[PDB]
Paper text:
The yeaZ gene product forms part of the conserved network YjeE/YeaZ/YgjD essential for survival of many eubacteria. and V. parahaemolyticus (C. Thomas, personal communication, 19 November 2010) demonstrated that among other as yet unidentified roles, YeaZ functions as a resuscitation promoting factor required for cells to be able to survive in, and exit from, a VBNC state. The structure of VpYeaZ confirmed that it is a member of the ASKHA superfamily of actin-like nucleotide-binding proteins characterized by two domains (I and II) that hold a nucleotide-binding site in the interdomain cleft. EcYeaZ has been shown to interact with the conserved essential proteins YjeE and YgjD, with YgjD being the preferred interaction partner.
In this paper, we report the crystal structure of V. parahaemolyticus YeaZ (VpYeaZ) to 3.1 Å resolution. The structure of VpYeaZ has been solved to 3.1 Å resolution revealing a two domain architecture with a duplicated βββαβαβα secondary structure. The asymmetric unit contains four subunits, each comprising residues 2–213. The 19 C-terminal residues are missing, most likely having been proteolytically removed during crystallization. Remarkably, YeaZ appears to be unique amongst other members of ASKHA superfamily in that it lacks these inserts; the lengths of loops β3α1, β4α2, α2β5 and β3′α1′ in VpYeaZ do not exceed five residues. Analysis of the packing of VpYeaZ monomers in the crystal lattice identified an obvious dimer with 2-fold symmetry and approximate dimensions of 30×45×80 Å. The dimer interface is formed by residues from helices α1 and α2 from both subunits, which form a 4-helical bundle. The dimer interface in this form shields 9–10% of the monomer surface area and buries a region of strongly conserved hydrophobic residues L40, L47, I74, I78, L82 (VpYeaZ numbering).
Numbering used by the authors:
A (entry chain D), B (entry chain A): 2 to 213
């Protein structure tokens, strides 16, 4: 179960490595650039483990949504390094990714992810931890102006723990629909969790090739 | 002398491979995306040569200028692939790159590269082929509004073959200074030429590590 993940999707540049239920995580809440940090971290991660790229049996990545430039860049490195160790690959949703963090720290089964898209819109989904440890998609991945989100889907009555930067960027507007809600201390996805999501795609045989 | 170059700087996505004075080139005048074409080409290149990444003794890349997203993306793959074959690397100027093409087709020793920056400015340099085959930098790499370029530097009296997309996007304005000039059929850099530039950085011992 040897997986190495990269994420470059939001403000947080992160790289982590699962080697048999032992996730050594690296993170950096990043700037205008990304390249300059992503390799050295992958190097750090691996030396602190004695693995090589061809040791790993999968290479995982934030597939987005998230920043256009950024989310491309990391996929670009994630291909680069896969190609050379002949690795299969695993794309992983930034949204569901943040749902896992919300379990990891808060033990929440009910997660509402809202990522601040640019120009007045929001990347949104909701997920729901099912018995297996998986996440039933309670709402499809969308991009919506939060206003419209509020008047669509009356949906349920449940305590959704809110994650990602949509929340703090459009309160006025996400303030408008009875779902129960809870603050989260979570802003961005992290490769910590991304791995643990990827670790179950393997066990479902759900990996692409290398040129996805 | 085994070098593989990637370029993703302008509208032209290109990958080529020098294996002993034999450059098998791949090119594609590309769209809104880049990832999807860059790997397969690097794969194509290598099968039609029986080399692997760890066969090569350097991996080169367009360092830019050029499109922000683009130029990051290629650099991102060119690190990814370097890292896994433990390769040294070689960044290469898109401008001087296009100077080489202008030799390759037209045999020009006097090149004026102007790339259409966005928002009313231009990426510009001038190079001059010295006896060795190197290129004296007749003007430092810049980013100027073409207007200002015209009234700066009276400079010389010589026949500069113009390349890159500045020329056709600001004629009125680049039309204003006596240098002699000649049309070129050249618009973007190509990994064809990038390699032959890289092949000489090696011979000067001028390669960075892998996390440049």
């Amino acid at each position: 179960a040897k997986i190495l993940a990269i994420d470059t999707a939001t403000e947080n540049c992160s790289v982590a490595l699962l080697v048999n239920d032992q996730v050594i995580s690296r993170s950096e809440v990043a700037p205008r650039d990304h390249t300059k940090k992503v390799l050295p971290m992958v190097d750090e991660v691996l030396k602190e483990a004695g693995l090589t790229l061809q040791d790993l049996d999968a290479l995982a990545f934030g597939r987005g949504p998230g920043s256009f430039t950024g989310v491309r860049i990391g996929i670009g490195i994630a291909q680069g390094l896969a190609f050379g160790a002949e690795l299969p690959m695993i794309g992983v949703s930034t949204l569901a990714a943040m749902a896992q963090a919300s379990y990891r720290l808060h033990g929440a089964t009910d997660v509402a992810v809202a990522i601040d898209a640019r120009m007045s819109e929001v990347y949104w989904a909701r997920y729901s931890r099912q018995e297996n440890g998986e996440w039933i998609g309670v709402d499809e991945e969308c991009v919506i102006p939060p206003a419209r989100l509020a008047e669509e889907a009356q949906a349920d009555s449940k305590t959704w723990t809110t994650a990602g930067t949509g929340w703090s960027a459009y309160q006025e507007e996400l303030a408008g629909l009875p779902f129960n809600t809870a603050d989260s201390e979570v802003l961005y996805p992290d490769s910590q969790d991304i791995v643990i999501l990827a670790k179950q795609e393997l066990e479902k045989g759900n990996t692409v090739p290398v040129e996805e």
